[PDB]
Design a protein around this ligand. Structure first.
Ligand SMILES: *C(=O)c1cc(-c2cccc3[nH]ncc23)cc(OC)c1OCC(=O)N(C)C
Ligand SMILES: *C(=O)c1cc(-c2cccc3[nH]ncc23)cc(OC)c1OCC(=O)N(C)C
Lengths: 306, 306
């Protein structure tokens, strides 16, 4: 028992991280088969980052202008292309450590692990949620661009995030591995509105079920509610509306705990209206929304990976 | 910027995890060079776990009674010995993935990453602190024994924890890699008092400095304090006494932020006496004590590992 914010084991991804240098900019790239993926703003100087014409800036570059280093070894770049906001550098060597992998575009509310990297070397790993407003609340310093977020299903790594920038508000923005930004952000240093962020209701309920499984249960009450009534409260507290799809994915947890989803919503309603009165749930004094229902079942059932 | 509970990259440790079977018990072992380390209670049946005589129970076992599996390959056991509460199985093959490593006994308040494993396969990674009472607040299910906690310094893995059991209170207990339990616990299924746990004061202060570095600063006040006065309050709130050694290790953070350690204690004093008034610090509504001062500098400076 016990419940922790648990990241995937990072070994499969560690073997894919390389360092990419262009001019005086160095950041991280992802080496899969014979292609290295990295943020296209690697080709930018500081004077270019206001309103960069990436097409024009990439034209001034040739294969030999991109230095790719995996550990202490050189890769040789034999082709380069831009896909949306990512650069794809073809190298002459397939990565011998390439895992089975897929590129996925995650939906808001879904979670993933982030391997924070500097100079092509792993620094640490943590679990993140894609916020409803398509930012992530990460931990990234200068040099971390090109760090990736991922999920693992047995032996297959699904890459879903590449880190591109920090907004002036201190939150983070990036792309999928096809180079499409999550949200409305662009890779230029301008003012960018993140937009109102809400709480991922289905994830809070998942965590409340996790709490019950683990012995934290003072918050269970003698009330129930309806989808519509609960959604009235959700709107008041800037929670995402609950749908029957969300109820359906909470099914397995309701079966495990014997607590109907709408009864757990009624507990959540009272917690929203009355607070926690200075108590805690799973070691937290606020409502946690970065565990999906799959995350809770995964952790509480001990699923492993190759 | 941003501050997250960050675990070490787990790849070096992933390559050391094996499955160990004895009788009908299967758990995790750590394969370093030609030795596999695992909890000695692998040799126990359920009827033995009340008052096991491990010496007598190990006498009934020979090398061929221990099945060690690394992935899908067999290791052959050519020697077995008991060191305190760990079994050391000599195998005929040195682990080709053995990292540079050391065995360390950590002190209370120090942190480490835990690679939770089942059947010799990694399930996830999270950051833990050794509580002052020598328990850890982990996430462990049946099958997780032999999962290990570790730190990494560049290319060297310092193993500090092997998971052995869950106490009836739901917290976790285990040994260093020489098999000495942390705390007063024993590997038998009996009643075991954890003892009063306190908050790791120096870690809370480290996190408050982390908050300031990251823009969370409403809690800075116009007061100061003295070691003795602050320690009066610490005692009242079940915080560990602050010593000049603790002040000294907070030096680098005070220099970075320009906030004297005793001024930060005065902020902590007011937070202890007045609470947070429904506000948050680094996304938390309670005072966090699982970041050491080194952890904060490590995360805020982007230290990497080979
Ligand atoms: C990419 O590595 C990168 C990183 C930053 C940056 C700075 C501070 C915090 C932070 N969090 N995520 C990213 C962060 C800034 C960069 O440039 C200013 C940057 O590299 C891009 C670059 O150097 N140019 C000129 C495009
Ligand atoms: C070791 O893998 C192990 C694990 C448990 C156990 C059960 C539930 C939660 C939990 N958290 N950490 C460890 C936990 C219980 C075991 O045996 C009852 C156990 O293996 C030891 C064993 O099977 N015997 C009989 C010694």
């Amino acid at each position: 028992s016990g419940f922790r914010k648990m990241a995937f084991p990072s070994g499969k991804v560690e073997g894919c991280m390389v360092q990419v240098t262009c001019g005086t900019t160095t950041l991280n790239g992802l080496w899969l088969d014979d292609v290295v993926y990295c943020p296209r703003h690697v080709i930018c100087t500081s004077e270019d980052m206001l309103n960069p014409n990436y097409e024009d800036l990439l034209i001034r570059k040739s294969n030999h202008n991109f230095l790719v280093q995996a550990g202490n070894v050189q890769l040789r770049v034999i082709g380069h292309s831009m896909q949306n906001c990512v650069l794809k550098l073809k190298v002459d060597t397939a990565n011998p450590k390439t895992p089975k992998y897929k590129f996925v575009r995650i939906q808001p509310g879904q979670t993933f692990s982030v391997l924070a990297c500097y100079n092509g070397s792993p620094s640490g790993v943590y679990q993140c949620a894609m916020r409803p407003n398509f930012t992530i609340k990460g931990s990234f310093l200068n040099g971390s661009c090109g760090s990736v977020g991922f999920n693992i299903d047995y032996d297959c790594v699904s890459f879903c995030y590449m880190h591109h920038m920090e907004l002036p508000t201190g939150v983070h923005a990036g792309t999928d591995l096809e180079g499409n930004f999550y949200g409305p952000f662009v890779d230029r240093q301008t003012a960018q509105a993140a937009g109102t962020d809400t709480t991922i209701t289905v994830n809070v309920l998942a965590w409340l079920y996790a709490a019950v499984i683990n012995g934290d249960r003072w918050f269970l009450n003698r009330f129930t509610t309806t989808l519509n009534d609960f959604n009235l409260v959700a709107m008041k507290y800037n929670y995402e509306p609950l749908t029957q799809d969300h109820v359906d994915i909470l099914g397995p947890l309701s079966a495990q705990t014997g607590i109907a989803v709408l009864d757990m919503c009624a507990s959540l309603k009272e917690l929203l209206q009355n607070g926690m009165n200075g108590r805690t749930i799973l070691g937290s004094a606020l409502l946690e929304d970065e565990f999906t229902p799959f995350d809770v079942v995964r952790q509480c059932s001990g699923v492993t990976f190759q």
